[PDB]
PDB file of C-alpha atoms and ligand atoms in Angstrom:
ATOM      1  CA  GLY A   1     -58.375  15.272 -34.867  1.00 44.89           C
ATOM      2  CA  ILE A   2     -55.512  17.301 -36.234  1.00 47.08           C
ATOM      3  CA  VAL A   3     -54.797  14.569 -38.823  1.00 47.26           C
ATOM      4  CA  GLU A   4     -58.404  14.473 -40.217  1.00 52.07           C
ATOM      5  CA  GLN A   5     -58.528  18.255 -40.751  1.00 54.30           C
ATOM      6  CA  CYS A   6     -54.878  19.145 -41.449  1.00 57.36           C
ATOM      7  CA  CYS A   7     -54.243  16.215 -43.838  1.00 56.79           C
ATOM      8  CA  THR A   8     -57.553  16.845 -45.614  1.00 53.82           C
ATOM      9  CA  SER A   9     -56.339  20.290 -46.693  1.00 53.06           C
ATOM     10  CA  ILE A  10     -53.338  22.361 -45.576  1.00 54.13           C
ATOM     11  CA  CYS A  11     -53.907  24.081 -42.266  1.00 56.71           C
ATOM     12  CA  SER A  12     -52.560  27.461 -41.719  1.00 54.77           C
ATOM     13  CA  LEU A  13     -49.915  27.808 -39.089  1.00 54.77           C
ATOM     14  CA  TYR A  14     -52.542  29.780 -37.181  1.00 53.92           C
ATOM     15  CA  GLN A  15     -54.861  26.780 -37.120  1.00 52.46           C
ATOM     16  CA  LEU A  16     -51.828  24.770 -35.915  1.00 49.36           C
ATOM     17  CA  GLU A  17     -51.049  27.157 -33.035  1.00 51.04           C
ATOM     18  CA  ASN A  18     -54.411  26.363 -31.511  1.00 53.35           C
ATOM     19  CA  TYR A  19     -53.079  22.827 -30.744  1.00 55.00           C
ATOM     20  CA  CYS A  20     -50.149  24.088 -28.632  1.00 54.31           C
ATOM     21  CA  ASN A  21     -50.365  23.742 -24.854  1.00 55.49           C
TER      22      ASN A  21
ATOM     23  CA  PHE B   1     -52.583   3.948 -49.130  1.00 55.06           C
ATOM     24  CA  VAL B   2     -50.828   5.201 -45.990  1.00 55.01           C
ATOM     25  CA  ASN B   3     -51.495   8.945 -46.711  1.00 49.16           C
ATOM     26  CA  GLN B   4     -52.646   9.926 -43.229  1.00 49.21           C
ATOM     27  CA  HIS B   5     -49.616   8.315 -41.614  1.00 47.36           C
ATOM     28  CA  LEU B   6     -47.224  10.278 -43.900  1.00 44.62           C
ATOM     29  CA  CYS B   7     -48.935  13.602 -43.364  1.00 46.48           C
ATOM     30  CA  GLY B   8     -48.952  12.943 -39.618  1.00 46.02           C
ATOM     31  CA  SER B   9     -45.148  12.705 -39.583  1.00 44.31           C
ATOM     32  CA  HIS B  10     -45.057  16.144 -41.232  1.00 45.63           C
ATOM     33  CA  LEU B  11     -47.596  17.584 -38.716  1.00 45.52           C
ATOM     34  CA  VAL B  12     -45.462  16.690 -35.695  1.00 47.71           C
ATOM     35  CA  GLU B  13     -42.597  18.577 -37.279  1.00 47.73           C
ATOM     36  CA  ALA B  14     -44.806  21.577 -37.931  1.00 47.02           C
ATOM     37  CA  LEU B  15     -46.246  21.340 -34.391  1.00 44.91           C
ATOM     38  CA  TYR B  16     -42.652  21.155 -33.124  1.00 44.60           C
ATOM     39  CA  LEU B  17     -41.743  24.383 -34.837  1.00 46.49           C
ATOM     40  CA  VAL B  18     -44.999  26.227 -34.052  1.00 48.12           C
ATOM     41  CA  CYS B  19     -45.328  25.180 -30.350  1.00 47.46           C
ATOM     42  CA  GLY B  20     -41.589  25.616 -29.798  1.00 49.62           C
ATOM     43  CA  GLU B  21     -40.260  22.667 -27.787  1.00 51.29           C
ATOM     44  CA  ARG B  22     -41.607  23.706 -24.468  1.00 53.42           C
ATOM     45  CA  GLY B  23     -44.968  22.793 -25.985  1.00 52.12           C
TER      46      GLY B  23
ATOM     47  CA  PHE C   1     -25.532  25.607 -31.533  1.00 52.26           C
ATOM     48  CA  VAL C   2     -29.081  24.246 -32.052  1.00 55.95           C
ATOM     49  CA  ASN C   3     -27.921  20.776 -31.108  1.00 55.79           C
ATOM     50  CA  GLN C   4     -30.793  20.187 -28.679  1.00 60.73           C
ATOM     51  CA  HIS C   5     -33.375  21.796 -30.928  1.00 59.99           C
ATOM     52  CA  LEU C   6     -32.397  19.608 -33.976  1.00 63.73           C
ATOM     53  CA  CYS C   7     -32.209  16.510 -31.792  1.00 64.41           C
ATOM     54  CA  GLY C   8     -35.709  17.216 -30.567  1.00 65.45           C
ATOM     55  CA  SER C   9     -37.049  17.485 -34.095  1.00 62.89           C
ATOM     56  CA  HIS C  10     -35.849  13.904 -34.598  1.00 61.18           C
ATOM     57  CA  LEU C  11     -37.278  12.808 -31.243  1.00 61.68           C
ATOM     58  CA  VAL C  12     -40.785  13.978 -32.101  1.00 60.30           C
ATOM     59  CA  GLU C  13     -40.506  11.918 -35.234  1.00 56.65           C
ATOM     60  CA  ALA C  14     -39.251   8.889 -33.451  1.00 53.15           C
ATOM     61  CA  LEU C  15     -42.025   9.284 -30.830  1.00 54.00           C
ATOM     62  CA  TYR C  16     -44.599   9.579 -33.587  1.00 48.62           C
ATOM     63  CA  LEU C  17     -43.425   6.324 -35.186  1.00 47.42           C
ATOM     64  CA  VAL C  18     -43.364   4.504 -31.834  1.00 47.48           C
ATOM     65  CA  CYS C  19     -46.557   6.334 -30.683  1.00 42.82           C
TER      66      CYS C  19
ATOM     67  CA  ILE D   1     -36.855  13.977 -22.016  1.00 42.63           C
ATOM     68  CA  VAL D   2     -34.644  15.815 -24.455  1.00 40.57           C
ATOM     69  CA  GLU D   3     -32.056  15.905 -21.673  1.00 37.81           C
ATOM     70  CA  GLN D   4     -31.621  12.134 -21.809  1.00 36.75           C
ATOM     71  CA  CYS D   5     -32.230  11.160 -25.445  1.00 37.37           C
ATOM     72  CA  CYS D   6     -29.931  13.956 -26.680  1.00 38.09           C
ATOM     73  CA  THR D   7     -27.015  13.173 -24.344  1.00 37.98           C
ATOM     74  CA  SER D   8     -27.391   9.527 -25.327  1.00 38.85           C
ATOM     75  CA  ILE D   9     -29.167   7.185 -27.750  1.00 39.13           C
ATOM     76  CA  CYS D  10     -32.691   6.146 -26.627  1.00 36.47           C
ATOM     77  CA  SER D  11     -34.055   2.762 -27.508  1.00 35.09           C
ATOM     78  CA  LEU D  12     -37.556   2.063 -28.826  1.00 36.41           C
ATOM     79  CA  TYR D  13     -38.433   0.883 -25.349  1.00 39.34           C
ATOM     80  CA  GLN D  14     -37.202   4.088 -23.686  1.00 40.91           C
ATOM     81  CA  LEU D  15     -39.301   5.960 -26.282  1.00 40.53           C
ATOM     82  CA  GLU D  16     -42.426   3.843 -25.645  1.00 40.32           C
ATOM     83  CA  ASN D  17     -42.111   4.907 -21.986  1.00 37.50           C
ATOM     84  CA  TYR D  18     -42.381   8.543 -23.004  1.00 40.84           C
ATOM     85  CA  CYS D  19     -45.854   7.796 -24.199  1.00 42.52           C
ATOM     86  CA  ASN D  20     -49.122   7.453 -22.280  1.00 41.00           C
TER      87      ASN D  20
ATOM     88  CA  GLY E   1     -27.145  35.772 -41.788  1.00 42.56           C
ATOM     89  CA  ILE E   2     -29.661  32.904 -41.666  1.00 40.83           C
ATOM     90  CA  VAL E   3     -27.213  30.057 -40.895  1.00 38.82           C
ATOM     91  CA  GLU E   4     -25.345  31.933 -38.260  1.00 40.54           C
ATOM     92  CA  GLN E   5     -28.348  33.454 -36.545  1.00 41.08           C
ATOM     93  CA  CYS E   6     -30.385  30.246 -36.652  1.00 38.48           C
ATOM     94  CA  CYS E   7     -27.620  27.623 -36.233  1.00 36.02           C
ATOM     95  CA  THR E   8     -26.212  29.623 -33.263  1.00 36.38           C
ATOM     96  CA  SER E   9     -29.549  29.670 -31.442  1.00 38.08           C
ATOM     97  CA  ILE E  10     -33.254  28.928 -32.044  1.00 38.67           C
ATOM     98  CA  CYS E  11     -35.206  30.971 -34.582  1.00 39.18           C
ATOM     99  CA  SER E  12     -38.934  31.077 -33.957  1.00 43.92           C
ATOM    100  CA  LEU E  13     -41.512  30.857 -36.721  1.00 44.59           C
ATOM    101  CA  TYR E  14     -41.937  34.660 -36.905  1.00 43.20           C
ATOM    102  CA  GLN E  15     -38.209  35.126 -37.138  1.00 40.97           C
ATOM    103  CA  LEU E  16     -37.770  32.638 -39.981  1.00 40.28           C
ATOM    104  CA  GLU E  17     -40.555  34.378 -41.855  1.00 36.83           C
ATOM    105  CA  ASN E  18     -38.408  37.494 -42.106  1.00 36.62           C
ATOM    106  CA  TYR E  19     -36.374  35.342 -44.503  1.00 38.16           C
ATOM    107  CA  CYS E  20     -39.276  34.784 -46.969  1.00 36.44           C
ATOM    108  CA  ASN E  21     -38.435  36.252 -50.431  1.00 36.69           C
TER     109      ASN E  21
ATOM    110  CA  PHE F   1     -18.350  16.957 -38.205  1.00 37.71           C
ATOM    111  CA  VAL F   2     -20.922  18.015 -40.863  1.00 40.03           C
ATOM    112  CA  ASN F   3     -22.897  20.271 -38.437  1.00 41.13           C
ATOM    113  CA  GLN F   4     -23.604  23.113 -40.834  1.00 36.47           C
ATOM    114  CA  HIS F   5     -24.971  20.738 -43.433  1.00 34.69           C
ATOM    115  CA  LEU F   6     -27.331  19.134 -40.901  1.00 35.61           C
ATOM    116  CA  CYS F   7     -28.679  22.445 -39.514  1.00 33.71           C
ATOM    117  CA  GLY F   8     -28.965  23.856 -43.034  1.00 32.58           C
ATOM    118  CA  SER F   9     -31.096  20.807 -43.760  1.00 30.83           C
ATOM    119  CA  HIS F  10     -33.593  21.601 -40.944  1.00 28.78           C
ATOM    120  CA  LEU F  11     -33.647  25.227 -41.943  1.00 30.15           C
ATOM    121  CA  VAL F  12     -34.660  24.640 -45.537  1.00 30.71           C
ATOM    122  CA  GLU F  13     -37.478  22.476 -44.194  1.00 28.52           C
ATOM    123  CA  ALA F  14     -38.631  25.062 -41.629  1.00 29.23           C
ATOM    124  CA  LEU F  15     -38.423  27.733 -44.359  1.00 32.56           C
ATOM    125  CA  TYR F  16     -40.612  25.626 -46.613  1.00 28.68           C
ATOM    126  CA  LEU F  17     -43.222  25.286 -43.902  1.00 29.94           C
ATOM    127  CA  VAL F  18     -43.349  29.021 -43.315  1.00 32.57           C
ATOM    128  CA  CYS F  19     -42.536  30.450 -46.783  1.00 34.84           C
ATOM    129  CA  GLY F  20     -43.610  27.731 -49.181  1.00 34.92           C
ATOM    130  CA  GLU F  21     -41.726  28.338 -52.377  1.00 35.41           C
TER     131      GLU F  21
ATOM    132  CA  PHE G   1     -23.808  13.654 -28.336  1.00 38.93           C
ATOM    133  CA  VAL G   2     -26.112  11.635 -30.451  1.00 42.32           C
ATOM    134  CA  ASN G   3     -24.222  13.226 -33.371  1.00 42.44           C
ATOM    135  CA  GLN G   4     -23.500  10.030 -35.298  1.00 41.14           C
ATOM    136  CA  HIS G   5     -27.093   8.961 -34.777  1.00 41.33           C
ATOM    137  CA  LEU G   6     -28.523  12.266 -36.109  1.00 38.94           C
ATOM    138  CA  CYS G   7     -26.146  12.492 -39.054  1.00 37.19           C
ATOM    139  CA  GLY G   8     -26.871   8.849 -40.057  1.00 37.74           C
ATOM    140  CA  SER G   9     -30.554   9.746 -40.151  1.00 37.78           C
ATOM    141  CA  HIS G  10     -29.952  12.355 -42.866  1.00 36.71           C
ATOM    142  CA  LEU G  11     -27.496   9.994 -44.427  1.00 38.18           C
ATOM    143  CA  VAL G  12     -30.020   7.313 -45.186  1.00 38.48           C
ATOM    144  CA  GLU G  13     -32.309   9.844 -46.678  1.00 38.29           C
ATOM    145  CA  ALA G  14     -29.527  11.041 -48.924  1.00 34.80           C
ATOM    146  CA  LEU G  15     -28.851   7.421 -49.921  1.00 36.90           C
ATOM    147  CA  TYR G  16     -32.526   6.781 -50.634  1.00 34.40           C
ATOM    148  CA  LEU G  17     -32.501   9.684 -53.098  1.00 35.72           C
ATOM    149  CA  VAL G  18     -29.410   8.402 -54.839  1.00 35.20           C
ATOM    150  CA  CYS G  19     -30.372   4.733 -55.032  1.00 38.02           C
ATOM    151  CA  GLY G  20     -33.792   5.752 -56.427  1.00 40.83           C
TER     152      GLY G  20
ATOM    153  CA  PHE H   1     -43.841   7.625 -59.103  1.00 41.01           C
ATOM    154  CA  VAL H   2     -44.221  10.324 -56.509  1.00 42.19           C
ATOM    155  CA  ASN H   3     -46.425   8.698 -53.890  1.00 42.35           C
ATOM    156  CA  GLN H   4     -44.339   5.581 -53.899  1.00 43.07           C
ATOM    157  CA  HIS H   5     -41.090   7.619 -53.540  1.00 46.26           C
ATOM    158  CA  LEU H   6     -42.579   9.700 -50.706  1.00 45.21           C
ATOM    159  CA  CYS H   7     -43.635   6.599 -48.840  1.00 46.65           C
ATOM    160  CA  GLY H   8     -40.251   4.969 -49.311  1.00 46.12           C
ATOM    161  CA  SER H   9     -38.565   8.069 -47.904  1.00 49.38           C
ATOM    162  CA  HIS H  10     -40.519   7.518 -44.697  1.00 49.53           C
ATOM    163  CA  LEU H  11     -39.802   3.764 -44.686  1.00 50.50           C
ATOM    164  CA  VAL H  12     -36.013   4.258 -44.555  1.00 50.04           C
ATOM    165  CA  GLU H  13     -36.175   6.706 -41.597  1.00 48.08           C
ATOM    166  CA  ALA H  14     -38.463   4.210 -39.881  1.00 49.73           C
ATOM    167  CA  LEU H  15     -36.030   1.330 -40.634  1.00 44.74           C
ATOM    168  CA  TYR H  16     -33.160   3.472 -39.427  1.00 47.42           C
ATOM    169  CA  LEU H  17     -34.753   3.774 -35.936  1.00 47.72           C
ATOM    170  CA  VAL H  18     -36.057   0.224 -35.677  1.00 48.16           C
ATOM    171  CA  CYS H  19     -32.946  -1.517 -36.972  1.00 46.89           C
ATOM    172  CA  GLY H  20     -30.361   0.078 -34.629  1.00 49.68           C
ATOM    173  CA  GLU H  21     -26.678  -1.005 -35.021  1.00 50.83           C
ATOM    174  CA  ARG H  22     -27.948  -3.841 -37.078  1.00 51.51           C
ATOM    175  CA  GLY H  23     -28.565  -1.587 -40.104  1.00 54.41           C
ATOM    176  CA  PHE H  24     -30.922  -2.265 -43.027  1.00 54.50           C
ATOM    177  CA  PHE H  25     -28.979  -1.668 -46.182  1.00 53.10           C
ATOM    178  CA  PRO H  26     -25.304  -1.327 -47.184  1.00 53.26           C
TER     179      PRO H  26
ATOM    180  CA  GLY I   1     -41.939  -6.519 -50.441  1.00 54.80           C
ATOM    181  CA  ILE I   2     -41.736  -3.722 -47.893  1.00 53.79           C
ATOM    182  CA  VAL I   3     -43.336  -1.166 -50.262  1.00 55.68           C
ATOM    183  CA  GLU I   4     -46.351  -3.339 -51.164  1.00 54.03           C
ATOM    184  CA  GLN I   5     -46.825  -4.305 -47.484  1.00 56.26           C
ATOM    185  CA  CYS I   6     -46.020  -1.015 -45.682  1.00 60.08           C
ATOM    186  CA  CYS I   7     -47.337   1.590 -48.153  1.00 57.82           C
ATOM    187  CA  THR I   8     -50.763  -0.020 -48.735  1.00 58.62           C
ATOM    188  CA  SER I   9     -51.367  -0.168 -44.971  1.00 55.71           C
ATOM    189  CA  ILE I  10     -49.482   0.850 -41.823  1.00 54.21           C
ATOM    190  CA  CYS I  11     -46.701  -1.463 -40.650  1.00 52.27           C
ATOM    191  CA  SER I  12     -46.073  -2.112 -36.942  1.00 56.32           C
ATOM    192  CA  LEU I  13     -42.569  -1.945 -35.444  1.00 58.87           C
ATOM    193  CA  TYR I  14     -42.329  -5.756 -35.814  1.00 56.91           C
ATOM    194  CA  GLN I  15     -43.413  -5.673 -39.482  1.00 57.26           C
ATOM    195  CA  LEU I  16     -40.695  -3.152 -40.047  1.00 55.94           C
ATOM    196  CA  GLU I  17     -38.057  -5.257 -38.153  1.00 54.49           C
ATOM    197  CA  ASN I  18     -38.504  -8.039 -40.761  1.00 53.25           C
ATOM    198  CA  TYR I  19     -36.589  -5.846 -43.237  1.00 54.17           C
ATOM    199  CA  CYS I  20     -33.577  -5.158 -41.042  1.00 52.90           C
ATOM    200  CA  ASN I  21     -30.250  -6.806 -41.784  1.00 50.61           C
TER     201      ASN I  21
ATOM    202  CA  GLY J   1     -18.129   2.488 -42.936  1.00 53.23           C
ATOM    203  CA  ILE J   2     -20.372   4.862 -44.842  1.00 47.01           C
ATOM    204  CA  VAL J   3     -21.153   6.444 -41.457  1.00 48.73           C
ATOM    205  CA  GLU J   4     -17.555   7.304 -40.389  1.00 48.96           C
ATOM    206  CA  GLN J   5     -16.922   8.489 -43.909  1.00 48.74           C
ATOM    207  CA  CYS J   6     -19.866  10.835 -44.434  1.00 50.26           C
ATOM    208  CA  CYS J   7     -20.317  12.134 -40.913  1.00 53.65           C
ATOM    209  CA  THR J   8     -16.748  13.515 -40.908  1.00 51.37           C
ATOM    210  CA  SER J   9     -17.022  15.574 -44.080  1.00 50.58           C
ATOM    211  CA  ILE J  10     -20.046  15.981 -46.372  1.00 49.55           C
ATOM    212  CA  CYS J  11     -20.292  13.218 -48.991  1.00 47.39           C
ATOM    213  CA  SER J  12     -21.256  13.930 -52.587  1.00 48.20           C
ATOM    214  CA  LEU J  13     -24.233  12.021 -53.949  1.00 47.11           C
ATOM    215  CA  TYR J  14     -21.711  10.241 -56.165  1.00 48.31           C
ATOM    216  CA  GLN J  15     -19.669   9.003 -53.228  1.00 47.75           C
ATOM    217  CA  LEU J  16     -23.097   7.950 -51.959  1.00 47.27           C
ATOM    218  CA  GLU J  17     -23.962   6.011 -55.138  1.00 49.55           C
ATOM    219  CA  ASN J  18     -21.043   3.561 -54.683  1.00 50.10           C
ATOM    220  CA  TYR J  19     -22.781   2.098 -51.570  1.00 49.61           C
ATOM    221  CA  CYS J  20     -26.072   1.517 -53.487  1.00 51.31           C
TER     222      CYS J  20
ATOM    223  CA  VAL K   1     -52.208  17.679 -49.437  1.00 53.60           C
ATOM    224  CA  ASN K   2     -49.786  14.954 -50.699  1.00 55.41           C
ATOM    225  CA  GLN K   3     -48.440  17.762 -52.923  1.00 53.28           C
ATOM    226  CA  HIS K   4     -47.560  20.267 -50.175  1.00 53.11           C
ATOM    227  CA  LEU K   5     -45.939  17.367 -48.385  1.00 52.28           C
ATOM    228  CA  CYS K   6     -44.086  16.359 -51.545  1.00 50.44           C
ATOM    229  CA  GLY K   7     -42.658  19.912 -51.787  1.00 53.47           C
ATOM    230  CA  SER K   8     -41.054  19.334 -48.381  1.00 53.47           C
ATOM    231  CA  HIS K   9     -39.154  16.370 -49.885  1.00 54.08           C
ATOM    232  CA  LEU K  10     -38.397  18.553 -52.946  1.00 54.60           C
ATOM    233  CA  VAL K  11     -36.414  21.149 -50.946  1.00 52.13           C
ATOM    234  CA  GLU K  12     -34.416  18.455 -49.193  1.00 50.70           C
ATOM    235  CA  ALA K  13     -33.623  16.962 -52.574  1.00 52.00           C
ATOM    236  CA  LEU K  14     -32.578  20.464 -53.840  1.00 52.59           C
ATOM    237  CA  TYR K  15     -30.480  21.270 -50.783  1.00 54.20           C
ATOM    238  CA  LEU K  16     -28.274  18.194 -51.245  1.00 57.71           C
ATOM    239  CA  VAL K  17     -28.180  18.194 -55.070  1.00 54.83           C
ATOM    240  CA  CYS K  18     -27.344  21.903 -55.091  1.00 57.50           C
ATOM    241  CA  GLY K  19     -25.077  22.460 -52.057  1.00 52.58           C
ATOM    242  CA  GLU K  20     -25.544  25.608 -49.932  1.00 52.18           C
ATOM    243  CA  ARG K  21     -27.164  28.940 -50.821  1.00 52.12           C
TER     244      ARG K  21
ATOM    245  CA  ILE L   1     -41.401  23.554 -59.525  1.00 48.03           C
ATOM    246  CA  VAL L   2     -43.523  21.961 -56.774  1.00 46.67           C
ATOM    247  CA  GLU L   3     -46.253  21.423 -59.383  1.00 48.37           C
ATOM    248  CA  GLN L   4     -43.847  19.914 -61.917  1.00 46.17           C
ATOM    249  CA  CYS L   5     -41.912  17.560 -59.614  1.00 45.08           C
ATOM    250  CA  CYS L   6     -44.953  16.439 -57.590  1.00 44.70           C
ATOM    251  CA  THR L   7     -47.298  15.600 -60.489  1.00 44.44           C
ATOM    252  CA  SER L   8     -44.521  13.748 -62.273  1.00 43.09           C
ATOM    253  CA  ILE L   9     -41.307  12.956 -60.388  1.00 43.38           C
ATOM    254  CA  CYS L  10     -38.094  14.864 -61.326  1.00 43.88           C
ATOM    255  CA  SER L  11     -34.730  13.140 -61.732  1.00 43.41           C
ATOM    256  CA  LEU L  12     -31.659  14.497 -59.953  1.00 40.72           C
ATOM    257  CA  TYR L  13     -30.500  15.789 -63.302  1.00 38.21           C
ATOM    258  CA  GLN L  14     -33.660  17.979 -63.712  1.00 40.62           C
ATOM    259  CA  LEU L  15     -33.324  19.287 -60.145  1.00 43.85           C
ATOM    260  CA  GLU L  16     -29.789  20.448 -60.902  1.00 44.19           C
ATOM    261  CA  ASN L  17     -31.204  23.043 -63.277  1.00 42.26           C
ATOM    262  CA  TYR L  18     -32.966  24.677 -60.328  1.00 40.46           C
ATOM    263  CA  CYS L  19     -29.568  25.086 -58.651  1.00 40.87           C
TER     264      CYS L  19
HETATM  265 CL1  LIG M 101     -44.804  12.501 -47.416  1.00 41.53          CL
HETATM  266 CL1  LIG M 102     -29.581  16.974 -37.076  1.00 40.37          CL
HETATM  267 ZN1  LIG M 103     -31.234  16.376 -38.167  1.00 43.61          ZN
HETATM  268 ZN1  LIG M 104     -43.088  13.029 -46.344  1.00 44.45          ZN
END
């Protein structure tokens, strides 16, 4: 999930936005 | 080591600020 | 004030730890 | 709810209930 | 400034980025 | 109450997330 | 109104820093 | 060292929530 | 100790309670 | 109480050290 | 990254060691 | 500074130089 790919390496805050409702 | 747990606490705070509290 | 906003940042953290 | 855990202190149990 | 603007009311991510130096 | 201090504290964090150094 | 409870949360992090 | 300090930082916030009025260190 | 037990693997809410006062 | 003390006015890290 | 994460703790440490600016 | 204090930990004294 988010943890496996955003803990791996630092996600951009664009990548992160895609997880918002 | 509990690395994924630690990072996860940071991710909720980043999700909080990105998705904006009605999110 | 950002009272509610700050409070919520703590909540998400509490909810993470409990969930 | 923010409304209820920011006007007063929520317990672990109240927090567990905000999960599912 | 930053404290006033952002401790008065919520500053979004795009708004806080205007403070990057 | 130490309200400025506490909000300042969340700000520096949110600035780090958006600005890095 | 959970002011004491929020402050105390930063407090313990400040203490953790100081007491190494 | 760093990773130990970082972890401990999260422990105390966690203890703060779980320990309520009780506390966890004076 | 809490470090050896809770940093090497994830502690439950009950494991954490053991270190309260 | 550390709490009452440092949630009224900001405590220095040295005030904080005493409670270590 | 444990490092990017660490930086987050670094600013909180600098905020309270330094004061406010 | 992130590099320096995250490879090896910095004491409060060192941090005070970055004030
Ligand atoms: Cl961390
Ligand atoms: Cl706060
Ligand atoms: Zn806070
Ligand atoms: Zn952390």
